[PDB]
Design a protein around this motif. Sequence first.
Motif, PDB file in Angstrom:
ATOM      1  N   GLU A  91     -10.242  -3.667  -3.801  1.00  0.00           N
ATOM      2  CA  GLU A  91     -10.202  -4.076  -5.179  1.00  0.00           C
ATOM      3  C   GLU A  91      -8.817  -4.469  -5.592  1.00  0.00           C
ATOM      4  N   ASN A  92      -7.924  -3.349  -5.383  1.00  0.00           N
ATOM      5  CA  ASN A  92      -6.547  -3.345  -5.929  1.00  0.00           C
ATOM      6  C   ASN A  92      -5.805  -4.524  -5.358  1.00  0.00           C
ATOM      7  N   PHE A  93      -6.165  -5.180  -4.337  1.00  0.00           N
ATOM      8  CA  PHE A  93      -5.368  -6.443  -3.652  1.00  0.00           C
ATOM      9  C   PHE A  93      -5.871  -7.662  -4.560  1.00  0.00           C
ATOM     10  N   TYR A 124       6.793   2.327  -8.484  1.00  0.00           N
ATOM     11  CA  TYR A 124       5.757   3.122  -7.901  1.00  0.00           C
ATOM     12  C   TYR A 124       4.959   3.917  -8.930  1.00  0.00           C
ATOM     13  N   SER A 125       3.858   4.640  -8.542  1.00  0.00           N
ATOM     14  CA  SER A 125       2.882   5.455  -9.428  1.00  0.00           C
ATOM     15  C   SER A 125       2.603   4.455 -10.511  1.00  0.00           C
ATOM     16  N   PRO A 126       1.984   3.071 -10.111  1.00  0.00           N
ATOM     17  CA  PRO A 126       1.777   2.174 -11.028  1.00  0.00           C
ATOM     18  C   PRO A 126       0.497   2.735 -11.716  1.00  0.00           C
ATOM     19  N   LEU A 127      -0.599   3.502 -11.160  1.00  0.00           N
ATOM     20  CA  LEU A 127      -1.669   3.845 -11.800  1.00  0.00           C
ATOM     21  C   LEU A 127      -1.534   5.209 -12.413  1.00  0.00           C
ATOM     22  N   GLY A 128      -0.337   5.754 -12.434  1.00  0.00           N
ATOM     23  CA  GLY A 128      -0.047   7.041 -13.034  1.00  0.00           C
ATOM     24  C   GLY A 128      -0.324   8.275 -12.177  1.00  0.00           C
ATOM     25  N   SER A 129      -0.571   8.277 -10.981  1.00  0.00           N
ATOM     26  CA  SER A 129      -0.583   9.047  -9.883  1.00  0.00           C
ATOM     27  C   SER A 129      -1.461  10.305 -10.314  1.00  0.00           C
ATOM     28  N   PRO A 130      -2.550   9.852 -10.569  1.00  0.00           N
ATOM     29  CA  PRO A 130      -3.964  11.037 -10.855  1.00  0.00           C
ATOM     30  C   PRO A 130      -3.955  12.128 -10.028  1.00  0.00           C
ATOM     31  N   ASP A 131      -3.836  11.955  -8.711  1.00  0.00           N
ATOM     32  CA  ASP A 131      -3.889  12.831  -7.763  1.00  0.00           C
ATOM     33  C   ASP A 131      -2.358  13.714  -7.506  1.00  0.00           C
ATOM     34  N   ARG A 132      -1.347  13.401  -8.316  1.00  0.00           N
ATOM     35  CA  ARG A 132      -0.054  14.146  -8.192  1.00  0.00           C
ATOM     36  C   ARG A 132      -0.484  15.550  -8.226  1.00  0.00           C
ATOM     37  N   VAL A 141       5.789  10.686 -13.778  1.00  0.00           N
ATOM     38  CA  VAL A 141       4.917  11.622 -12.889  1.00  0.00           C
ATOM     39  C   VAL A 141       5.877  12.423 -11.947  1.00  0.00           C
ATOM     40  N   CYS A 142       6.924  11.732 -11.544  1.00  0.00           N
ATOM     41  CA  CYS A 142       7.990  12.275 -10.479  1.00  0.00           C
ATOM     42  C   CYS A 142       9.072  12.536 -11.348  1.00  0.00           C
ATOM     43  N   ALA A 143       9.162  13.874 -11.754  1.00  0.00           N
ATOM     44  CA  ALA A 143      10.661  14.127 -12.523  1.00  0.00           C
ATOM     45  C   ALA A 143      11.302  15.245 -11.748  1.00  0.00           C
ATOM     46  N   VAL A 201       8.464  12.206   4.433  1.00  0.00           N
ATOM     47  CA  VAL A 201       8.205  13.465   3.668  1.00  0.00           C
ATOM     48  C   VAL A 201       6.649  13.547   3.414  1.00  0.00           C
ATOM     49  N   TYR A 202       5.977  12.337   3.595  1.00  0.00           N
ATOM     50  CA  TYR A 202       4.693  12.237   3.476  1.00  0.00           C
ATOM     51  C   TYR A 202       3.860  12.805   4.337  1.00  0.00           C
ATOM     52  N   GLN A 203       4.628  12.836   5.636  1.00  0.00           N
ATOM     53  CA  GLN A 203       3.959  13.887   6.632  1.00  0.00           C
ATOM     54  C   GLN A 203       2.656  13.163   7.336  1.00  0.00           C
ATOM     55  N   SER A 208      -3.953   4.139  -2.167  1.00  0.00           N
ATOM     56  CA  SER A 208      -5.365   4.569  -2.090  1.00  0.00           C
ATOM     57  C   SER A 208      -5.796   4.782  -0.657  1.00  0.00           C
ATOM     58  N   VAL A 209      -6.628   5.721  -0.293  1.00  0.00           N
ATOM     59  CA  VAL A 209      -7.318   5.897   0.814  1.00  0.00           C
ATOM     60  C   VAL A 209      -8.769   5.503   0.771  1.00  0.00           C
ATOM     61  N   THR A 210      -9.381   5.072  -0.363  1.00  0.00           N
ATOM     62  CA  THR A 210     -10.702   4.696  -0.524  1.00  0.00           C
ATOM     63  C   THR A 210     -11.109   3.292  -0.112  1.00  0.00           C
ATOM     64  N   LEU A 259       0.719  -1.037  -0.031  1.00  0.00           N
ATOM     65  CA  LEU A 259       0.041   0.060   0.053  1.00  0.00           C
ATOM     66  C   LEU A 259       0.959   1.146   0.290  1.00  0.00           C
ATOM     67  N   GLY A 260       0.776   2.121  -1.030  1.00  0.00           N
ATOM     68  CA  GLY A 260       1.447   3.442  -0.954  1.00  0.00           C
ATOM     69  C   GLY A 260       0.644   4.382  -0.058  1.00  0.00           C
ATOM     70  N   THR A 261       1.237   5.372   0.535  1.00  0.00           N
ATOM     71  CA  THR A 261       0.786   6.451   1.278  1.00  0.00           C
ATOM     72  C   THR A 261       1.126   7.824   1.127  1.00  0.00           C
ATOM     73  N   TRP A 262       1.629   7.819  -0.173  1.00  0.00           N
ATOM     74  CA  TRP A 262       2.161   9.503  -0.742  1.00  0.00           C
ATOM     75  C   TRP A 262       0.752  10.086  -0.929  1.00  0.00           C
ATOM     76  N   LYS A 263       0.576  11.257  -0.179  1.00  0.00           N
ATOM     77  CA  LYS A 263      -0.609  12.015  -0.601  1.00  0.00           C
ATOM     78  C   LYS A 263      -2.190  11.565   0.133  1.00  0.00           C
TER      79      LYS A 263
HETATM   80  N1  LIG Z   1      10.087   6.694  -4.129  1.00  0.00           N
HETATM   81  C1  LIG Z   1       9.331   8.035  -4.500  1.00  0.00           C
HETATM   82  O1  LIG Z   1      10.012   8.979  -5.078  1.00  0.00           O
HETATM   83  C2  LIG Z   1       8.147   7.552  -4.633  1.00  0.00           C
HETATM   84  C3  LIG Z   1       7.328   8.639  -5.635  1.00  0.00           C
HETATM   85  C4  LIG Z   1       6.010   8.490  -5.864  1.00  0.00           C
HETATM   86  C5  LIG Z   1       5.273   7.501  -5.161  1.00  0.00           C
HETATM   87  N2  LIG Z   1       5.785   6.484  -4.641  1.00  0.00           N
HETATM   88  C6  LIG Z   1       5.051   5.605  -3.526  1.00  0.00           C
HETATM   89  O2  LIG Z   1       4.384   4.680  -4.574  1.00  0.00           O
HETATM   90  C7  LIG Z   1       2.856   4.956  -4.033  1.00  0.00           C
HETATM   91  C8  LIG Z   1       2.066   4.719  -5.509  1.00  0.00           C
HETATM   92  O3  LIG Z   1       2.093   5.925  -6.263  1.00  0.00           O
HETATM   93  P1  LIG Z   1       1.328   7.275  -6.246  1.00  0.00           P
HETATM   94  O4  LIG Z   1       0.729   7.400  -4.952  1.00  0.00           O
HETATM   95  O5  LIG Z   1       1.942   8.251  -6.922  1.00  0.00           O
HETATM   96  O6  LIG Z   1       0.002   6.987  -7.421  1.00  0.00           O
HETATM   97  P2  LIG Z   1      -0.795   5.592  -7.943  1.00  0.00           P
HETATM   98  O7  LIG Z   1      -0.556   4.552  -6.832  1.00  0.00           O
HETATM   99  O8  LIG Z   1      -0.327   5.496  -9.273  1.00  0.00           O
HETATM  100  O9  LIG Z   1      -2.111   6.522  -7.963  1.00  0.00           O
HETATM  101  C9  LIG Z   1      -2.880   6.915  -6.742  1.00  0.00           C
HETATM  102  C10 LIG Z   1      -4.031   7.499  -7.205  1.00  0.00           C
HETATM  103  O10 LIG Z   1      -4.923   6.411  -7.934  1.00  0.00           O
HETATM  104  C11 LIG Z   1      -6.036   6.649  -7.099  1.00  0.00           C
HETATM  105  N3  LIG Z   1      -6.518   5.103  -7.069  1.00  0.00           N
HETATM  106  C12 LIG Z   1      -6.140   4.165  -6.320  1.00  0.00           C
HETATM  107  N4  LIG Z   1      -6.839   2.916  -6.697  1.00  0.00           N
HETATM  108  C13 LIG Z   1      -7.871   3.291  -7.701  1.00  0.00           C
HETATM  109  C14 LIG Z   1      -8.736   2.521  -8.318  1.00  0.00           C
HETATM  110  N5  LIG Z   1      -9.027   1.185  -8.108  1.00  0.00           N
HETATM  111  N6  LIG Z   1      -9.598   3.109  -9.370  1.00  0.00           N
HETATM  112  C15 LIG Z   1      -9.152   4.338  -9.484  1.00  0.00           C
HETATM  113  N7  LIG Z   1      -8.421   5.355  -8.734  1.00  0.00           N
HETATM  114  C16 LIG Z   1      -7.645   4.559  -7.917  1.00  0.00           C
HETATM  115  C17 LIG Z   1      -5.944   7.025  -5.722  1.00  0.00           C
HETATM  116  O11 LIG Z   1      -7.171   7.723  -5.435  1.00  0.00           O
HETATM  117  P3  LIG Z   1      -7.600   7.386  -3.826  1.00  0.00           P
HETATM  118  O12 LIG Z   1      -6.516   7.324  -3.089  1.00  0.00           O
HETATM  119  O13 LIG Z   1      -8.367   8.851  -3.593  1.00  0.00           O
HETATM  120  O14 LIG Z   1      -8.628   6.185  -3.861  1.00  0.00           O
HETATM  121  C18 LIG Z   1      -4.920   8.141  -6.197  1.00  0.00           C
HETATM  122  O15 LIG Z   1      -5.360   9.236  -6.595  1.00  0.00           O
HETATM  123  C19 LIG Z   1       2.900   6.321  -3.385  1.00  0.00           C
HETATM  124  O16 LIG Z   1       1.748   6.520  -2.529  1.00  0.00           O
HETATM  125  C20 LIG Z   1       4.317   6.167  -2.625  1.00  0.00           C
HETATM  126  O17 LIG Z   1       3.984   5.047  -1.533  1.00  0.00           O
HETATM  127  C21 LIG Z   1       7.207   6.625  -4.227  1.00  0.00           C
END
Ligand SMILES: NC(=O)c1ccc[n+]([C@@H]2O[C@H](COP(=O)([O-])OP(=O)(O)OC[C@H]3O[C@@H](n4cnc5c(N)ncnc54)[C@H](OP(=O)(O)O)[C@@H]3O)[C@@H](O)[C@H]2O)c1
Length: 315
Positions: free
Chosen positions: A271-273, A209-217, A297-299, A47-49, A263-265, A17-21
């Motif tokens: 579902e994701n699991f 990371y960002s496997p869903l493309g971080s729509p909340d970035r 996403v993270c440049a 840094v995720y506070q 996700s926090v939903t 489970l990711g926790t950024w944002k």
């Molecule tokens: N090492 C680093 O530099 C680094 C950088 C970026 C990220 N990461 C880590 O990787 C994790 C994952 O990356 P991420 O947070 O950037 O983005 P992500 O996991 O690609 O996408 C998260 C976004 O997707 C939404 N989401 C989750 N499940 C969904 C679903 N089944 N259907 C539709 N929307 C869904 C979430 O909404 P809700 O939360 O509102 O449900 C959230 O807005 C981070 O949380 C962090 O732990 C590490």
Amino acid sequence: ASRILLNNGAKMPILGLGTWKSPPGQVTEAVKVAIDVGYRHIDCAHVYQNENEVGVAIQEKLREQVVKREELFIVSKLWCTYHEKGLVKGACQKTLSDLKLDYLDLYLIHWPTGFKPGKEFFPLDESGNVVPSDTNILDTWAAMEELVDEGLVKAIGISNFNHLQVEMILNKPGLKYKPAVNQIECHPYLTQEKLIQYCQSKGIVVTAYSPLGSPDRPWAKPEDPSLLEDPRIKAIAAKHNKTTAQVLIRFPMQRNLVVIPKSVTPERIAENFKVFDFELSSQDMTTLLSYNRNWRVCALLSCTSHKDYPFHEEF
Ligand SMILES: NC(=O)c1ccc[n+]([C@@H]2O[C@H](COP(=O)([O-])OP(=O)(O)OC[C@H]3O[C@@H](n4cnc5c(N)ncnc54)[C@H](OP(=O)(O)O)[C@@H]3O)[C@@H](O)[C@H]2O)c1
Ligand SMILES: O=C(O)COC(=O)c1cc2ccccc2c2c1S(=O)(=O)N(CC(=O)O)C2=O
């Protein structure tokens, strides 16, 4: 299998489970639900506070007897403002104290770039460039090694390191621990074939990371590509009677990567699991790999002049 072997003999669950944002006011419930439906790996960072609130959830489920600590795989990361050798232990202990843990399973150098020490997470000049620190990867690594030797962390690794930066560590004379993991951005628009081949051939596990493309970035633009709404990937999902997210989570799993969707939903966390009940075919995999556009996403665009900025190299 649900877990992958690390160089320290420990096994790391491949879905975390990711926790950024994830806001402090919602991540406690997110973590509790996640643990209830099967997650054993939580990806954290100072840094995720929100590490306090993550720690709350973990403590409650330990006390409920839902899980044992040895079953959990908790990851955190050393932020950029703490790269100086003299600051590393304190940053690790601060995370531990917030998480209410006495060890981490994995601790990563969050970025190769060190920043000016201080309260501010991104100290900037007056022209938007980051203020760096006088630290280097190898000294920071030595300080991370101490943490293993002191029992505060079971494994150490890196994140957002390019292959030359990983090689700096690998080739370090006097190296005490190789990095166990390199956590990098990875998804069908940034497929990372070359860095993934590199790492895996060096016995380093890759976490995507960002496997869903971080729509909340926070810097999302309208013209930007949106993986979750890609009609092509939607078609692959519909064919498997799964959702697009499930497809996007299963894809790295079938490349022998760890993946950490956020996700926090509660419904989405569950579902994701549910991605161990189907297989993407060879065509699926090939098709998704073909969508690569080298899009990040993270440049870390505020640090492009930093001496250790990672993304000038091809990989
Ligand atoms: N090492 C680093 O530099 C680094 C950088 C970026 C990220 N990461 C880590 O990787 C994790 C994952 O990356 P991420 O947070 O950037 O983005 P992500 O996991 O690609 O996408 C998260 C976004 O997707 C939404 N989401 C989750 N499940 C969904 C679903 N089944 N259907 C539709 N929307 C869904 C979430 O909404 P809700 O939360 O509102 O449900 C959230 O807005 C981070 O949380 C962090 O732990 C590490
Ligand atoms: O500096 C820039 O060019 C853009 O701002 C950021 O990238 C930024 C700011 C941030 C400002 C305050 C807290 C966190 C911030 C993060 C990030 S991030 O996307 O690197 N990133 C994800 C990660 O490191 O795991 C962050 O947790």
